[PDB]
């Protein structure tokens, strides 16, 4: 009548909360990408303004 089930449930409870931490860590990696894309998008826009000034150098 041994209940190391308690020990293996308790080993699952940790693993479960770890998952939610993993999940939250995944969400954070997701929002970072977006900030990075917005950063890439902003510097591309800056690159496009130099390119314009080059294109327009005669008139």
């Amino acid at each position: 009548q041994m209940d190391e089930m308690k020990q293996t449930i308790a080993k699952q409870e940790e693993d479960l909360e770890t998952m939610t931490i993993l999940r939250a860590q995944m969400e954070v990696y997701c929002s970072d990408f977006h900030a990075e894309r917005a950063a890439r998008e902003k510097i591309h826009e800056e690159k496009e303004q130099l390119a314009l000034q080059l294109a327009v150098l005669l008139k």
Binding site: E17, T18, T20, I21, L22, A24, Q25, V28, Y29, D32, A35, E36, A39, I43
Partner: protein
């Protein structure tokens, strides 16, 4: 079996053991039944000085026979705790003792509850689970005692990389303050930290009370791939690399982050920003250096 132990105060405590045991490991059974270390214990029965480890059945000791316990006033090691009143108290310790053990003895002498106790040795606060030998606390050392105030508590922060760190906090403290204390301990800038308790993301601006965070609570730490401010550096080759920085980063701080990426020793780096040379003692902020500013890297040839 079952043998009795009578101090001269008449008190009789009783536990079970077998005749094969020796004098030495019985004392260890005495220490966790009412609480006396083995370097303060000396056992007598029938005028035969029981000496630390010739077999019990060598002295002819049978069940139900009563032993006589004598107690030293003193163990082998004393330390001193200085209070903020200027009162200094004297503790009986062993190097194996945990800071929580030491805290219990402070409660015993002075009534101060352990969760209200903070202990400092050599400018360093000592953590509940480590021993006196871990901190090199030797005979006759002085610890300093500081009480937690204003609901003060310790809490724990855990990363996925296994690390579990301990923090000294108050309920009025904000999530930003907690992150700053995490920075002070771990180097991690706060804009790269997010904190989780229960399953809520903890918002900057709210306090520990707001999230109902009580003593010895555990927060989880998750690290961002990027903070809020990046600058660009130009390599010796001539490639752009990106640095996670803060305006309070020093120039030595920035050079180290370059070593991590380009492997160039800091004493060999020279950093230019719009003509000017970046000096070591200085910060990004002192130079008017913004997000997405570009620096140039040149060697010093030393």
């Amino acid at each position: 079996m079952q043998i009795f132990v009578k101090t001269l105060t008449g008190k009789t405590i009783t536990l079970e053991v077998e005749p094969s045991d020796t004098i030495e490991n019985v004392k260890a059974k005495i220490q966790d039944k009412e609480g006396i270390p083995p370097d303060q214990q000396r056992l007598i029965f029938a005028g035969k000085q029981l000496e630390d480890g010739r077999t019990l059945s060598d002295y002819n000791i049978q069940k139900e026979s009563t032993l006589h316990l004598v107690l030293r006033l003193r163990g082998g090691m004393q330390i001193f705790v200085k209070t903020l009143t200027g009162k200094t108290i004297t503790l009986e310790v062993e190097p194996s003792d945990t800071i929580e053990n030491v805290k219990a003895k402070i409660q015993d002498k002075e009534g101060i509850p352990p969760d209200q106790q903070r202990l400092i040795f050599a400018g360093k606060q000592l953590e509940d689970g480590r021993t006196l030998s871990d901190y090199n606390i030797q005979k006759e050392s002085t610890l300093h005692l500081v009480l937690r105030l204003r609901g003060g508590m310790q809490i724990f922060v855990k990363t996925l990389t296994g690390k579990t760190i301990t923090l000294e906090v108050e309920p009025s403290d904000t999530i930003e303050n907690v992150k700053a204390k995490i920075q002070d301990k771990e180097g991690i800038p706060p804009d790269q930290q997010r904190l989780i308790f229960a399953g809520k993301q903890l918002e900057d601006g709210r306090t520990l009370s707001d999230y109902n965070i009580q003593k010895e609570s555990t927060l989880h730490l998750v690290l961002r791939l990027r903070g809020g401010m990046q600058i660009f550096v130009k390599t010796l080759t001539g490639k752009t690399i990106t640095l996670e920085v803060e305006p309070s980063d020093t120039i030595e701080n920035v050079k180290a982050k370059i070593q991590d990426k380009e492997g160039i020793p800091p004493d060999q780096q020279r950093l230019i920003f719009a003509g000017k040379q970046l000096e070591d003692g200085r910060t990004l902020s002192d130079y008017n250096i913004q997000k997405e500013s570009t620096l140039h890297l040149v060697l010093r040839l030393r």
